[PDB]
Write a protein that binds this ligand. Structure first.
Ligand code: NI
Ligand code: NI
Ligand code: NI
Length: 120
């Protein structure tokens, strides 16, 4: 499991072949670039382990860099590895209430630092 496999599960997968996967990879790259150029997201990203880095990329892939950067309080919790504190707030969001199954997987990934939520 990795960010690409993770996002394929959360997003559709399937449609379009190697040309479609170029667009997918480009969107993953754009998400990472969005993180690394944002003053609020980069220090969080830098502090995170490889598994939780994927979780953050996932959020930015879905909502965009400006959207994710709006989670100021949760991002602070993530930066100091207070996973449960972050989880409480992230679960109370437009994001969660619009895509609850995906958001729960992403949040659980933040909580555990494992890929267990994607083993199903
Ligand atoms: Ni602080
Ligand atoms: Ni602490
Ligand atoms: Ni709080």
């Amino acid at each position: 499991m990795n960010i690409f496999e993770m996002l394929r599960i959360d997003e559709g997968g399937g449609s379009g072949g190697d040309e479609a996967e170029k667009l997918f990879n480009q969107d993953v790259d754009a998400a990472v670039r969005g993180i690394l150029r944002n003053a609020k997201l980069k220090p969080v990203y830098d502090s995170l382990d490889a598994v939780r880095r994927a979780a953050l990329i996932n959020m930015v892939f879905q909502m965009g860099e400006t959207g994710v950067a709006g989670f100021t309080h949760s991002l602070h919790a993530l930066q100091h590895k207070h996973w449960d504190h972050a989880a409480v707030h992230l679960a109370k969001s437009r994001w969660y209430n619009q895509t609850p199954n995906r958001a729960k997987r992403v949040i659980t990934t933040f909580r555990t630092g494992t890929w267990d939520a994607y083993k199903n």
